[PDB]
C-alpha cells in the first residue's frame, strides 16, 4: 500500500465530505425559500379573502337595507320576516369584522414572520458557514500530519536498511563508521514514533470533529428556523383565523335561533285576536233590537190567549218537526266539512323541510296539487251548504224557543 | 213615541250594521293584500339571496383554484395550508347548494302559497258575501213586520175610541149599530195581537241571526286564510331555510376542525426527521478515518516508550488543565444562550389569538419588536462563541482521552 495511494483514498473521502457539506447548504437554502413562498401565499390568500368577505358583506347589507326601506301589534309572519332581515344585517356586520381581522391582524403577522425568516436565515447561514469552515480546517490539518509521518517513516526504513549492511561489512575503522549509523537510526526511529503518535492523535481529533457535526451540530442547525418562532408564530396566526371563524358561527347561531323561535310562534288565533283588538269599532257586536211599543202598549210578551193558543201550538209543533230533521241533515254536512278540512291540514303539514340530503357528497307533485285544489273546492261547497242550513236553523230555533217558553209541553 | 220616530231609530241601527259589514269586507281584503305583498317580498329576498350566495361561492371557488394551481412527506405547515384550501373549496360547494335550495325548493313554495292565497280569498269573499246578504235579509224582513204591527195597532186604537162613543150614545136601533162596533173591535184587537206576536218572534230571529254572525260566523271567516295552510306552508318554507343553514354550519365545522387538528400537529422535530429521511444521502455520517499504515507498519497504537513517556505525561496533564478551565467557561456561555433562547420562546408563544372582542357590539408593539430583534441578535452572538468554544474542547478532549487510556494516572 503506497504513499500516493494512501493519500488519494483520503483525498476522495475529503472531497466526498466537501461535496456533502455544499449539498446541506443548498438544502437549507431551498427550505428557507419554501418557508418564504408559503408566507407569501398565506398573505395573498388572506388579502383576496378579506376582499371576498367584504363584497359578500356589502351585498348582504344592501339586500337587508332594500327590504327594510320597503317599510301596531305585529302578526306572527311579519315578525319572522323582521327577524330574517335582522339575521342578514347581522351576517353583514360579521363579515365586515372578518375583513378587518384578516387585514389588521392576521396579515400583519404573516408579514412579520416573513421579514424574520429572512433575517434569521442570514444569521443561520453564518452559523452554517462557521461550522463548515471549522470542519474543513480539521480535515485539511490531517493531510500534513499524515505526510510528516509518511516522511519520518521513509527515513526510519532507509536507515535500518543501511544498518543491515553496516553489520554485514563487519577492520577497526569500519566499526567507528557503523556506530554512527546506529546513532542515526536511534535518532530516526524515535522521529518515526513521535510523528506516528501525532497522527494517531490527529485521527482521534478528526473523527471526533466529524461526528459532532454530523450527529449534533447539523441537527441543531436544521431546527434553528422553527426553534426561533416560525411554528409558534404560524400557530398564533391560524388560531386567530379559527378564533374569528368560531365567533361568526356563534353570532350566526344566535341569529338563526331568533328565526326558529318566531317560526315556532306562527299562530293564527293570536293573530286573529290581535286583528280584532286593533280595530274594535269594526268587530264589536251591536245593541240587540228591543221591542218598540206603539202608542204606549201595555203588554210586551207573547199573548197566548184564546183562540190563538191552538194556532201557536200548531206552529210550535211544526217548527220542532223541521228543526229535528234539518239539524240531523246539517250535522251530516258539518261532519263532511270537518273531515274535508282535516284532509287539507294533512297535506299542508307534511314534514318536507329537512334538506340534508342536498349537502351529501318527481313530477307527481302536480298530481297531488290538483287533488289538493279539488279538495279545497269541495270543502267550500260543503261550507256554503252548511252555512245556508245553519242560518235557517238559527231563526227557527229562535222562534220555536220563544213559543215553547210561553206554552209549555204537557 | 211616534211611528216614524220608532222606524227612524231602527233605520239608523241598520245603517250602522250595513256600514260595519262593509268595513269588515275592506279589512279582510286589506289583510289578503298584506299576505300577498309578504310572499312577494319573501320571493324577491330569496331570489336576490340565491344570487348573492352564488357570487360568494364563485369567488371562493376561484380563490382556492388559484392556490391549488400554484402547486414526498408533507411538512406540518404545508399540511395546514392544504387543509385551509380544502375548507375554502368546501364552503364554495356549500353555498352553491344553498343557491339550488333557495331556487329549486324554497321559492317554488312561496309561489305556490301566493297562487293559493289569491284563489282562496275569492272563495272566502264569496262566503263573506253570502253571510252578509243573509244578515241583510233578516234585518230588512223586520221593517215590514214592524209596520204590519204598527198598522193593526192604529186600527185597534181607533176602533176602541169609537166604541167609547158607541156606549156614551146609549133608542132601539142605536143598540143594533153599536153591537157591530164590538164586532169590529173584537176583530181588530185580535189582528193587533196576531201582528204583535209576529214582531216579538221577528225580534227573536233578528237578534239570534245578528249574534251568530258577530260571535261565530265573523270569527270563522277571519281565520279561513291561515286555517287552509298559510301558516303551515310558511312554517315548512322557513324550516327549509333553517335546515339549509344548519347543514352549512355543520359542514363548515367539520372543515375548520381539520384545520385545528393540523395546527395542533405543527411540529418542528417531526418535520426535521421527515427532512432527513427524504434526503438520506445528504445527512448520513461518513466512514470514520482509519489509521493507514505506511510500508506495512507493525504497531498502530500510541507508543509510550522511553523517553517519550515523560513528554506524553506533560502533554496529557496540560491538556487536562485547559479542558477543565475551558469547559467551565463554555458551560457559562451555554447557560446564557439557553436563557436567551427561552426569552425568545416566551415572546413568540404569547396567546394573542382570540379575537372575540371584535364581534362585541397600541404602538408599543414596535418597542417590543425591537427588543425581540436585539434578543435574537444577542442569542446568535453567544451561539457563535459557544460553538467556537465547543469545537476546541472537542479536539482537546479527543486527544487527551487517547493519552489517558495509554498512560493511566497513578
Tab-separated table of C-alpha atoms in Angstrom, chain B residues 157-170 178 181-182 185:
chain	number	residue	atom	x	y	z
B	157	UNK	CA	-156.765	52.094	18.928
B	158	UNK	CA	-159.244	53.841	16.507
B	159	UNK	CA	-161.998	51.178	16.893
B	160	UNK	CA	-161.703	51.252	20.727
B	161	UNK	CA	-162.136	55.073	20.664
B	162	UNK	CA	-165.294	54.867	18.550
B	163	UNK	CA	-166.690	52.208	20.921
B	164	UNK	CA	-166.217	54.745	23.808
B	165	UNK	CA	-168.804	56.861	21.980
B	166	UNK	CA	-170.933	53.850	20.870
B	167	UNK	CA	-171.804	53.296	24.555
B	168	UNK	CA	-171.932	57.017	25.524
B	169	UNK	CA	-174.625	57.486	22.815
B	170	UNK	CA	-176.655	54.830	24.684
B	178	UNK	CA	-173.128	49.780	18.403
B	181	UNK	CA	-168.680	48.250	16.592
B	182	UNK	CA	-167.968	45.494	19.231
B	185	UNK	CA	-163.162	45.788	17.791
